[PDB]
C-alpha cells in the first residue's frame, strides 16, 4: 500500500520520562512505514533478543497494528520479561502471554534515572490476592488485609500498603541499577496493513 508517513520509533526510545512498572504506558503505532534498521545500528549494549520473528527479517513484513510498552525496572528483573516466567514483576506488575510474537528491548539507564540522594519516584507492587491476566493493568491503591481483623483504611500489621519503592542510587552494582525496557507486540491475521515496512 502507498503510505507516506514514517513510524515514530524515536518518539518511544528517546523519551524523557518513562512510566512506572505498575502503570506502564501503552501506545498504538499504525499507518506508517517502519524502519527497524535504526535499532541494530546502536552500540552493542542494547539487549535486543526477541521471539517469534528474527530481527533481520522485520523489514519485509506487514503488520496489522504495533503496540509499544515502556517501563523502568531493576537490572536483574529483566530476565522476568519473557513468556512463561514467574516472579514478583511477572506475577504482580507485567505479564506476557505464552504466544507473544513480538520483541523485547532493554538498555542501561544509570546515568539518567539514578540520583545520589536516592530516587523514590519509581514504584512496584508487592501485594495482590491473585496473579494477573496477560496484558492487564491494576492502578489501584488500597489496604490489603492479610489476616482477618478488618481495618478502616489504616496502616497496620496485617493491613498492608501494596506499593513499594526501588531507591535507586549510583552506589550499587549492576544488578540493582535501573534499566529501561521497551516491548513491541505485533498482530498478524486480516492485515489491512497499517505497518508496511520499506519496500517499493
Amino acid at each position: 500500500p502507498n503510505i507516506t508517513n514514517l513510524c515514530p520509533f524515536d518518539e518511544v526510545f528517546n523519551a524523557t520520562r518513562f512510566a512506572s512498572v505498575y502503570a506502564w504506558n501503552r501506545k498504538r503505532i499504525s499507518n506508517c512505514v517502519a524502519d527497524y534498521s535504526v535499532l541494530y545500528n546502536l552500540a552493542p549494549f542494547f539487549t535486543f533478543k526477541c521471539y517469534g520473528v528474527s530481527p533481520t527479517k522485520l523489514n519485509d513484513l506487514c503488520f496489522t497494528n504495533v503496540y509499544a510498552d515502556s517501563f523502568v525496572i531493576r537490572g536483574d528483573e529483566v530476565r522476568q520479561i519473557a513468556p512463561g516466567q514467574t516472579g514478583n514483576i511477572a506475577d504482580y506488575n507485567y505479564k506476557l502471554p505464552d504466544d507473544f510474537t513480538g520483541c523485547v528491548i532493554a538498555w542501561n539507564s544509570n546515568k539518567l534515572d539514578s540520583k545520589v540522594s536516592g530516587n523514590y519516584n519509581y514504584l512496584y507492587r508487592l501485594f495482590r490476592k491473585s496473579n494477573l491476566k496477560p496484558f492487564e493493568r491494576d492502578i489501584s491503591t488500597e489496604i490489603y488485609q492479610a489476616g482477618n481483623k478488618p481495618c478502616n483504611g489504616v496502616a497496620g500489621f496485617n493491613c498492608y500498603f501494596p506499593l513499594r519503592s526501588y531507591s535507586f542510587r549510583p552506589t550499587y552494582g549492576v544488578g540493582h541499577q535501573p534499566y529501561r525496557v521497551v516491548v513491541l507486540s505485533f498482530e498478524l491475521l486480516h492485515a489491512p496493513a497499517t505497518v508496511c515496512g520499506p519496500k517499493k
Epitope: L6, P8, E11, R17, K27, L112
Partner: antibody, heavy 124, light 105 residues
C-alpha cells in the same frame, strides 16, 4: 542536507498583523514539529510556541496565548505564523526551527533541542 | 517558571586556553532537558550539546558539558578563532526557557 528557508522582511505598520513562512526540505516532514523563536535587536532569545505537523496540536507560550496562531500544510511542506494586534515593542528577528524537544504524534518530551534553524526574518 | 542565570555576562580570555561557563537553575532541572547553543555574530544559532553530556552532529571534540540538579557547566578544551561567540543554555523540564547569554572575546 536539511535546510529551511523563510520569507522576506516586512515593514508592517503598527496595529496590523503579519504572516511569516518557512519551507522545509531534506527530511520527512511529518516526523518532526516546528518551533518559533524570536530575538530582539540587542537582547536574547525567546520562545513563541510549538506546532505538530502530524495532527495540528499546538502549545503556545503564556505571554502570547491569545495573540498568535500557527498553521502547517503538508502539501507544500511550509509552516505559517500569524501574529495579531502588533505592538511597537515587537520589532525583532523571528526564527523557524526543527523541534526535537517534544514529540509530534504523542506530544511527550524528548531528549534534544532545536537542531536546525532558518535564515531569519526581520519584522518592524 | 524555571529561571536560568548565566555568570559572568562577558568573558575576556586569551586565544588558546580553556574556558568555562555557568548556567545555574533556580529549581531542579532534570539532566534530560538541558542543551546549549552557539550564535556567531550575523548568523543563526546552532546546537552544540544536548542532554547536558551528549554532543550534536558535526561538533568537534573540544566542546564538553556536565552537571546535574542545579549547576551545569560548559567547558572548551582550547580556543580557535571560530569559537568566539555568544552561548545560551536551554531547559524544557517545565515549559521552555532560555538563558541570558554569555559573550566571549
Amino acid at each position: 542536507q536539511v535546510q529551511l528557508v523563510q520569507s522576506g522582511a516586512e515593514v508592517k505598520k503598527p496595529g496590523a498583523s503579519v504572516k511569516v513562512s518557512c519551507k522545509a526540505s531534506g527530511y520527512p516532514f511529518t516526523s518532526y514539529g516546528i518551533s518559533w523563536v524570536r530575538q530582539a535587536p540587542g537582547q536574547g532569545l525567546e520562545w513563541m510556541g510549538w506546532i505538530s505537523t502530524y495532527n495540528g496540536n499546538t502549545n503556545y507560550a503564556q505571554k502570547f496565548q491569545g495573540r498568535v496562531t500557527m498553521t502547517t500544510d503538508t502539501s507544500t511542506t511550509t509552516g505559517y505564523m500569524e501574529l495579531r494586534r502588533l505592538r511597537s515593542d515587537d520589532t525583532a528577528v523571528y526564527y523557524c526551527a526543527r523541534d526535537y524537544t517534544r514529540g509530534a504524534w504523542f506530544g511527550e518530551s524528548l531528549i534534544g533541542g532545536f537542531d536546525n534553524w532558518g535564515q531569519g526574518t526581520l519584522v518592524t | 517558571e524555571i529561571v536560568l542565570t548565566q555568570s559572568p555576562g562577558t568573558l575576556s580570555l586569551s586565544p588558546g586556553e580553556r574556558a568555562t561557563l555557568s548556567c545555574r537553575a533556580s529549581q531542579t532541572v532534570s539532566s534530560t532537558s538541558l542543551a546549549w547553543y552557539q550564535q556567531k555574530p550575523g548568523q543563526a544559532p546552532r546546537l552544540l550539546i544536548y542532554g547536558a553530556s551528549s554532543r550534536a552532529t558535526g561538533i568537534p571534540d573540544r566542546f564538553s558539558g556536565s552537571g546535574s540538579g542545579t549547576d551545569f557547566t560548559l567547558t572548551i578544551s582550547r580556543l580557535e578563532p571560530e569559537d568566539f561567540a555568544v552561548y545560551y543554555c536551554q531547559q524544557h523540564d517545565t515549559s521552555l526557557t532560555f538563558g541570558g547569554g554569555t559573550k566571549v572575546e
